[PDB]
Amino acid sequence: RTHSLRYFRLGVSDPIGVPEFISVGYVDSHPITTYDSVTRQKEPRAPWMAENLAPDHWERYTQLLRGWQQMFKVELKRLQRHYNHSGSHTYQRMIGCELLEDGSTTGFLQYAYDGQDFLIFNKDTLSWLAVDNVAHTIKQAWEANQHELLYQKNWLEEECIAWLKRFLEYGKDTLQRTEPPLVRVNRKETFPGVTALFCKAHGFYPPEIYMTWMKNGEEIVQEIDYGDILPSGDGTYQAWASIELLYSCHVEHSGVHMVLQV
Amino acid sequence: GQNIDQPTEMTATEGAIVQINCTYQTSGFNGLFWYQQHAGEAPTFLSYNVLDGLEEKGRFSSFLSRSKGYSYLLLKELQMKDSASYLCAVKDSNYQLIWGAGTKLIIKPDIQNPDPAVYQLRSVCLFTDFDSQTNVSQSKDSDVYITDKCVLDMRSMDFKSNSAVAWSNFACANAFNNSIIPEDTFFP
Amino acid sequence: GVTQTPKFQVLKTGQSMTLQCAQDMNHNSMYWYRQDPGMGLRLIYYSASEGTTDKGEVPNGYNVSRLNKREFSLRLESAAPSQTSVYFCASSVWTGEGSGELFFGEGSRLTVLEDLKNVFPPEVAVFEPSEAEISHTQKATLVCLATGFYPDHVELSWWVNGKEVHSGVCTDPQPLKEQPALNDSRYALSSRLRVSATFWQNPRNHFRCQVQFYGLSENDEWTQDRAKPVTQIVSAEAWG
Amino acid sequence: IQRTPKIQVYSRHPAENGKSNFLNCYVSGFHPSDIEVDLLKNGERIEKVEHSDLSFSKDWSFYLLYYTEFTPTEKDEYACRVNHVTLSQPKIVKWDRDM
Ligand SMILES: Cc1nc2c(=O)[nH]c(=O)nc-2n(C[C@H](O)[C@H](O)[C@H](O)CO)c1O
Numbered sequence: 024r025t026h027s028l029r030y031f032r033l034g035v036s037d038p039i040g041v042p043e044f045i046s047v048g049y050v051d052s053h054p055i056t057t058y059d060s061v062t063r064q065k066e067p068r069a070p071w072m073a074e075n076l077a078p079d080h081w082e083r084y085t086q087l088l089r090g091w092q093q094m095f096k097v098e099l100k101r102l103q104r105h106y107n108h109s110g111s112h113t114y115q116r117m118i119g120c121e122l123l124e125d126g127s128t129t130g131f132l133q134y135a136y137d138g139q140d141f142l143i144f145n146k147d148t149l150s151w152l153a154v155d156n157v158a159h160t161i162k163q164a165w166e167a168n169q170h171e172l173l174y175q176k177n178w179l180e181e182e183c184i185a186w187l188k189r190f191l192e193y194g195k196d197t198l199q200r201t202e203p204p205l206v207r208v209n210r211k212e213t214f215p216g217v218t219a220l221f222c223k224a225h226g227f228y229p230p231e232i233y234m235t236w237m238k239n240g241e242e243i244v245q246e247i248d249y250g251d252i253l254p255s256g257d258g259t260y261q262a263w264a265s266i267e268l269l270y271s272c273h274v275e276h277s278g279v280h281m282v283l284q285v
Numbered sequence: 286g287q288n289i290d291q292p293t294e295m296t297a298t299e300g301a302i303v304q305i306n307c308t309y310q311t312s313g314f315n316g317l318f319w320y321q322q323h324a325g326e327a328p329t330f331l332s333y334n335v336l337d338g339l340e341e342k343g344r345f346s347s348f349l350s351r352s353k354g355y356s357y358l359l360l361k362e363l364q365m366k367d368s369a370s371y372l373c374a375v376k377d378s379n380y381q382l383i384w385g386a387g388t389k390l391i392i393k394p395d396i397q398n399p400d401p402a403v404y405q406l407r408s409v410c411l412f413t414d415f416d417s418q419t420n421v422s423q424s425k426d427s428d429v430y431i432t433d434k435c436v437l438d439m440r441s442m443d444f445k446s447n448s449a450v451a452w453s454n455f456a457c458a459n460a461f462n463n464s465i466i467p468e469d470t471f472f473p
Numbered sequence: 474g475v476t477q478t479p480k481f482q483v484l485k486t487g488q489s490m491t492l493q494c495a496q497d498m499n500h501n502s503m504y505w506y507r508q509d510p511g512m513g514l515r516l517i518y519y520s521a522s523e524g525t526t527d528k529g530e531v532p533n534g535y536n537v538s539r540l541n542k543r544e545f546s547l548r549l550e551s552a553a554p555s556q557t558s559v560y561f562c563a564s565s566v567w568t569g570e571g572s573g574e575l576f577f578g579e580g581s582r583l584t585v586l587e588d589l590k591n592v593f594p595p596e597v598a599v600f601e602p603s604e605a606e607i608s609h610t611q612k613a614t615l616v617c618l619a620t621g622f623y624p625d626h627v628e629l630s631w632w633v634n635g636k637e638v639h640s641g642v643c644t645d646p647q648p649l650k651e652q653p654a655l656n657d658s659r660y661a662l663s664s665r666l667r668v669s670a671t672f673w674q675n676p677r678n679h680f681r682c683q684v685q686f687y688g689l690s691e692n693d694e695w696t697q698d699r700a701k702p703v704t705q706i707v708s709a710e711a712w713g
Numbered sequence: 714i715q716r717t718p719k720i721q722v723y724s725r726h727p728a729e730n731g732k733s734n735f736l737n738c739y740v741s742g743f744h745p746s747d748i749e750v751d752l753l754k755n756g757e758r759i760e761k762v763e764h765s766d767l768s769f770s771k772d773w774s775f776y777l778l779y780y781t782e783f784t785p786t787e788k789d790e791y792a793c794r795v796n797h798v799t800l801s802q803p804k805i806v807k808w809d810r811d812m
Contacts, residue, residue: 031769033746041747047769057766068766082527083379087569090501090521094567113745115773138744138773139714170333174316174571177335181351182313182378207727225726255725256735256780289513315571324646327561328514330574372514380569384513400610404603409616411603411665427653432663435643439612439667448643450616450663473605 024229024277026051026198028187029119034095036103037111044092049119050190051198052230052254058088071194102136105157113137120183122191130179146176201277202228202259208272208283220285222272223250225261230254233275234264240271286312286377289385296391297363298417299445305358305371305388313378319347319358320372322387328372331358360390365438365445368392393417394436394445402471403457410460413448415467421449422464429453431461474498477562477578481626481687481704483592484552484585492547492581494562502568503545504575505529505537507558514561520545521568552585559583582687584624589693591657592702594686595622599709602673613673615666615711617682621651623659626687631666634679641667678713716774717799718743720806722792728785728811736783736808738793741776749796750779753805754789785810 033045047068048056054068065085067073099114115135122128132144142161143152149172151162166172191198204227213219222234230252236243243266250263264272272283288310297303309317316335320328332340334349334356346359360367373385400414412421424431432450439445451460458472478493494503505517506529516529520539534556536548545564549556562578586592598620602613619627625648631638648660664682672678688702695701719742725735740750746767752759765778779793791808 029771033769035746039747045767047766049769054766054768080379083381086519086521086525086527087380089525090568093501093522093524111745115769117769117771135773137714138716140773168572170335170572171570174335178315178571182315185313186378223727251721253721253723253737253739254778256737256778257725261723293511318574320575325580327577327579328575329577333572333574335571374513376571380571382514382516382575384515386511386513402606402609404606404614406600406603406614406616409600409618411606411614411616413606413614414610430649430651430661432645432649433647435645435665437641437643437665437667440640442669446667448614448665450618450665452618471609473603473609 024124024231025121026187026191027119027121028183028190029117030056032091032095032114032116034099034114035111036099036113039111044095046088046091050187050194053194053197055190055194056084058085058092060092063089069194069197071197072190075193102157102161105160106136118179118183120179120187122184122187128180128184130176130183132175132179144175146179149173149176197258200228202226203279204232204274204276204281206272206274206281206283208285210285213267218268219265220268220270220272221263221265222274222283223261223263224274224276225255226259227261227276228259229277230260231276232260232262233273234262235273236264236266237271237273239269286379286381286383289373289375289383291371291373291385291388293386294389294391296393298393299363299365299395301363303360303363303390305360305373305390307356307358307373307385309354309356309373309375309383311354311375311377311383314351314354315376315378315380317347317349317356318374318376318382319356320374322370322372324369331371363392365392365394365436394438394447396445396447399467400471401467401469402473403461403466404473405457408452408455410451410457411448412451412461412464412466412470414446415470417447419447419467420464421461424451425463426453429455429460431463474576475562475564475578477560477581479581480579481582482584483589483624483626483687483689483693484549484583485589486552486554486585486587488552490549490552490583492549492560492562493544494546494578495544496564496576497543498564498566498576499542500564500566500576501542502565503539504563504565505535505545505547506561506563507531508561508580509558517547517560519568549583552583554585554587557583557585582626584626586624589689589695589702590697591623591659592688593621593623593659594688594702594705595619595627595660595662595684595707597682597684597707597709599680599682599711601711607670607673611670613668613670615668615673615680615682617664617666617684617709618661619648619663619684619707620661621659622648622661622686623657625660627660627662628685629662629664630683630685631664632681632683633666633668638666673713675713680711680713681708682710683708714744715799716742716744718748718795718797720793720795720804722806722808724785724808724811725780730785730787733782733784736781736791738779738795738806739776740779740793740795742770742772742774743776743797743799744774745798746775747798748775748777749803750777751794752779752781753792753794754783756790756792758794 042059044060058065120130134142153159153162204224248265252262270285274281291307319331322328332347370387399416504519506514518537520526560581563575600616644664648662650658652658721739796803
């Protein structure tokens, strides 16, 4: 199925307890690595990362992260100067890639300032999309170094995917498993003359699930309320969908379709 | 991170073209660099490739094939100042540079009017003005010393010539006896 | 760009030494490499940013200090003969970036010896153009010979009427071993200066071969009877 | 721009009075990152509470999961108490008892 690898960076100027810099990695919804300006160490966040990557890996990336921390500190100072901003502001980065079930791939690299899009890299055109004049100033400086754009295209298309395939093998017993959902339909008259139908699912992995309500075997036109896909705390997830009023709930998960006729 | 291979040495003629190959076997790839290092000097950046293709910078071009794990440095219209060592370096998955042992490039001058001769300076024996094909050999005795072949360039007169020196604490007639010198070598 | 010191140094086994390196390019990453014949550059230590350092491939016998953003010193705790090498400092804008190149310092040649008793400056001699060369080719070749020096720490240059010439000059890239069977063989180096036969025939033209030898410092101890083989210039002159 | 947290309180398994379970409080979609989360039993802070590290979303907001082992009863009222810069006072969100 579809899998992804992502790395985030968070920089905070003048932090109140809160680290000045944090960086976390993820494979799908699972945290794999962490670093912050307090520990100043890159550490695993999944036992399958810890057991398959030698101490030299964590040692080398600890040094790189100490450098990337200093880079974030200085870029955020320059951004605050450009905007004429004082006090506490945030700077964020997200880099990563996706390996789609059809073998095709995606790659992304983006920055945010104070939690809003700032610069979005387009690896297919080798350009940065800027949201305002300050972002345009930065885009011009970054686009002036042709080699760094080519390096970034290669990292997103080749290195990121190779790292993702490596980690999928290390964590295959967690990441490639399937735990089917337990699904039920609850019926209840709520406000006089208003019957609510809930289709509730839990105990499933991966978190991706499709739930819908059908009427006489065809697509609905009335309002469907959707519950978020939430972690249950044991590595599995839960979700629900509801309607008010022949109804049937349809659930699709990991290549298995299920129908619950009311 | 594992292995980089480039030839130890290459020889080509002034005015011609030379291609320096570099093959790599690494754990990940984040780019390939070429550096130039003149004798007794520091290496200096020449080029960087990370995607497939050929990038030209004047007389120098650098090629990369990611699928073959192969790069070359192409030098055109060869000049005497191109004599140097050329280093190939690859950045692996953890951004560490894996360095090749370097390629020593030797440029043979094109000698227009060869005039091979062995002269005596006041003692020192100088073998000069021979064609770039001729090779000088090391001395048999430890009391006699022979230098290797050297190229000097008289810029203002647009003239280049080869030479070797020989001395001892011995005569110029049998000074370069261990080397295969041309038939018509002038022995005054 | 990158300023590295000293250019040359002779050390006795067990002596301590510090190599200095400074860059004013506002770079964050600094590196110390050693270069030895027949192999690729080997990283000793590096500093990805101010306030952090880590071992390279060959850290044993060395230590470093990232003193500030600009400076990265390399220390040799107890000099050993295996540390005889050419050391290069380098810097890059950052690390964990793909395209950023290195900027290298000029290099530091270190020679580590059991004792300093075989250290000698060169004898320098200039050899006058042949008569048979002047008439046969209409050009005059001068030869300079630096002999009997140890270690191989020399810089030869030609000076014509007080000015450093490069045109018409060829210096041996490597010195030859005067006693090839001896582990501590002394060295010889030759250079040629070729000029037009007229330029040499002019009695007003002055030719000078200069050899800068890098030897012992005033601070080094010397108990031997012969004169102390200090860092010095040795030269020979020729009149046209 | 600041974003106030979404707070969802729910049990690990469908809840039944007298049957051992876990109470979750998922706090998400907030910005900036400083936040305080407590799980409460009849208005009193529960001491044995586990939590995930601060997590990162693609939309630049953050999320966390707080949880505790518990046995639901008719008398016991459980809530999630959250404080963030967007809030004038701590917000106490009551568990809907798996309604
Ligand atoms: C291994 C690894 N770790 C991190 C990390 O902990 N934090 C992070 O932001 N990025 C990591 N990367 C991705 C990549 O090497 C890095 O983000 C480059 O700067 C992007 O080209 C990584 O490859």
